[PDB]
Design an enzyme around this catalytic site. Structure first.
Site, PDB file in Angstrom:
ATOM      1  CG  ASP A  25      39.349  -0.616  22.838  1.00 22.97           C
ATOM      2  OD1 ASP A  25      39.786   0.192  21.982  1.00 22.97           O
ATOM      3  OD2 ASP A  25      40.004  -1.022  23.790  1.00 22.97           O
ATOM      4  CB  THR A  26      38.010   1.473  17.214  1.00 18.74           C
ATOM      5  OG1 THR A  26      38.513   2.679  17.795  1.00 18.74           O
ATOM      6  CG2 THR A  26      36.504   1.584  17.044  1.00 18.74           C
ATOM      7  N   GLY A  27      40.566   0.431  19.203  1.00 14.19           N
ATOM      8  CA  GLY A  27      41.996   0.225  19.332  1.00 14.19           C
ATOM      9  C   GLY A  27      42.376  -1.183  19.715  1.00 14.19           C
TER      10      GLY A  27
HETATM   11  N1  LIG Z   1      40.930   4.729  31.681  1.00 12.90           N
HETATM   12  C1  LIG Z   1      41.451   3.663  30.778  1.00 12.90           C
HETATM   13  C2  LIG Z   1      41.986   4.388  29.575  1.00 12.90           C
HETATM   14  O1  LIG Z   1      41.237   5.088  28.916  1.00 12.90           O
HETATM   15  N2  LIG Z   1      43.332   4.242  29.340  1.00 12.90           N
HETATM   16  C3  LIG Z   1      43.945   4.913  28.255  1.00 12.90           C
HETATM   17  C4  LIG Z   1      43.810   6.282  28.117  1.00 12.90           C
HETATM   18  N3  LIG Z   1      44.348   7.014  27.134  1.00 12.90           N
HETATM   19  C5  LIG Z   1      45.088   6.349  26.238  1.00 12.90           C
HETATM   20  C6  LIG Z   1      45.282   4.987  26.302  1.00 12.90           C
HETATM   21  F1  LIG Z   1      46.028   4.395  25.353  1.00 12.90           F
HETATM   22  C7  LIG Z   1      44.709   4.242  27.316  1.00 12.90           C
HETATM   23  C8  LIG Z   1      44.921   2.759  27.398  1.00 12.90           C
HETATM   24  C9  LIG Z   1      43.733   1.942  26.931  1.00 12.90           C
HETATM   25  C10 LIG Z   1      43.701   1.813  25.426  1.00 12.90           C
HETATM   26  C11 LIG Z   1      42.379   1.162  25.050  1.00 12.90           C
HETATM   27  N4  LIG Z   1      42.379   0.708  23.628  1.00 12.90           N
HETATM   28  C12 LIG Z   1      43.609   0.015  23.151  1.00 12.90           C
HETATM   29  C13 LIG Z   1      43.607  -1.432  23.598  1.00 12.90           C
HETATM   30  O2  LIG Z   1      44.458  -2.118  22.693  1.00 12.90           O
HETATM   31  C14 LIG Z   1      45.483  -2.765  23.302  1.00 12.90           C
HETATM   32  O3  LIG Z   1      45.582  -2.936  24.505  1.00 12.90           O
HETATM   33  N5  LIG Z   1      46.398  -3.231  22.408  1.00 12.90           N
HETATM   34  C15 LIG Z   1      46.357  -2.923  21.001  1.00 12.90           C
HETATM   35  C16 LIG Z   1      47.265  -1.759  20.689  1.00 12.90           C
HETATM   36  F2  LIG Z   1      46.841  -0.611  21.273  1.00 12.90           F
HETATM   37  F3  LIG Z   1      48.543  -2.036  21.076  1.00 12.90           F
HETATM   38  F4  LIG Z   1      47.300  -1.486  19.359  1.00 12.90           F
HETATM   39  C17 LIG Z   1      44.826   0.801  23.627  1.00 12.90           C
HETATM   40  O4  LIG Z   1      44.788   0.978  25.046  1.00 12.90           O
HETATM   41  C18 LIG Z   1      40.336   2.710  30.325  1.00 12.90           C
HETATM   42  C19 LIG Z   1      40.894   1.463  29.658  1.00 12.90           C
HETATM   43  C20 LIG Z   1      41.904   0.691  30.226  1.00 12.90           C
HETATM   44  C21 LIG Z   1      42.357  -0.460  29.600  1.00 12.90           C
HETATM   45  C22 LIG Z   1      41.794  -0.866  28.404  1.00 12.90           C
HETATM   46 CL1  LIG Z   1      42.355  -2.299  27.625  1.00 12.90          CL
HETATM   47  C23 LIG Z   1      40.784  -0.123  27.835  1.00 12.90           C
HETATM   48  C24 LIG Z   1      40.331   1.026  28.463  1.00 12.90           C
HETATM   49  C25 LIG Z   1      39.392   2.252  31.405  1.00 12.90           C
HETATM   50  C26 LIG Z   1      39.827   1.655  32.580  1.00 12.90           C
HETATM   51  C27 LIG Z   1      38.926   1.221  33.530  1.00 12.90           C
HETATM   52  F5  LIG Z   1      39.352   0.631  34.668  1.00 12.90           F
HETATM   53  C28 LIG Z   1      37.576   1.357  33.313  1.00 12.90           C
HETATM   54  C29 LIG Z   1      37.138   1.941  32.145  1.00 12.90           C
HETATM   55  F6  LIG Z   1      35.819   2.076  31.932  1.00 12.90           F
HETATM   56  C30 LIG Z   1      38.034   2.389  31.191  1.00 12.90           C
END
Ligand SMILES: N[C@H](C(=O)Nc1cncc(F)c1CC[C@@H]1CN[C@H](COC(=O)NCC(F)(F)F)CO1)[C@@H](c1ccc(Cl)cc1)c1cc(F)cc(F)c1
Ligand SMILES: [Cl-]
Ligand SMILES: [Cl-]
Lengths: 99, 99
Positions: A25-27
């Protein structure tokens, strides 16, 4: 390796003697793993993102093996919906984004 | 380009003739932007992040430039803490993870 993004970039990791699946996760600034025991000291932390914040335990100097590459760093443990490997460990395995 | 992960992979995007900053996020399935006006009709969608789920507005076939690369696809608008470019558009610009 070169990992495409047609599907979630899930990889096998080894942490605290356990094999787990985690998302590259690069984010994410940090690495967050679902509830498990880790050795050593910890301190509480709040991390935020989509949906708001969760409370986690911060363990420092934890050795991890990601897709066959060893690294060390801070690992957060708490109620994340998915195990995520964040930038703090992606840098250590030499992971980059390319386009 | 090749983007390392020592810092957040923030890039300039252009949407609706306006420049914004967004994070290249391999952990995100979708692209989600903070409140703005987009043309056309929207559909409801729920997305789940580190802290839980949020409701967003789903706009399809939106023109968006990402770090100078043109994409046309789905953009979600809602209460995200940061603008996120997810896999749906990272694949359109030919982005991969490499190590
Ligand atoms: N399906 C879910 C998804 O894709 N959600 C989604 C979709 N479109 C746009 C989005 F934004 C999101 C939210 C997630 C992104 C992930 N990377 C960043 C993490 O960084 C920070 O939280 N904070 C730093 C800052 F973002 F604030 F900078 C930003 O949130 C997925 C997921 C859920 C939570 C997390 Cl953590 C990671 C992935 C997933 C759920 C699951 F149960 C099983 C899986 F295999 C995959
Ligand atoms: Cl670290
Ligand atoms: Cl480097």
């Amino acid at each position: 390796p070169q990992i495409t993004l047609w599907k979630r970039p899930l990889v096998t990791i080894k942490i605290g003697g356990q094999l787990k699946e985690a998302l590259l996760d690069t984010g994410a600034d940090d690495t967050v793993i679902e509830e498990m025991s880790l050795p050593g000291r910890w301190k509480p932390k709040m991390i935020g993102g989509i949906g708001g914040f969760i409370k986690v335990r911060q363990y420092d100097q934890i050795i991890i093996e990601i897709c066959g590459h060893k690294a060390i760093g801070t690992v957060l443990v708490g109620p994340t919906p998915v195990n995520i490997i964040g930038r703090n460990l992606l840098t250590q395995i030499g992971c980059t984004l390319n386009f």
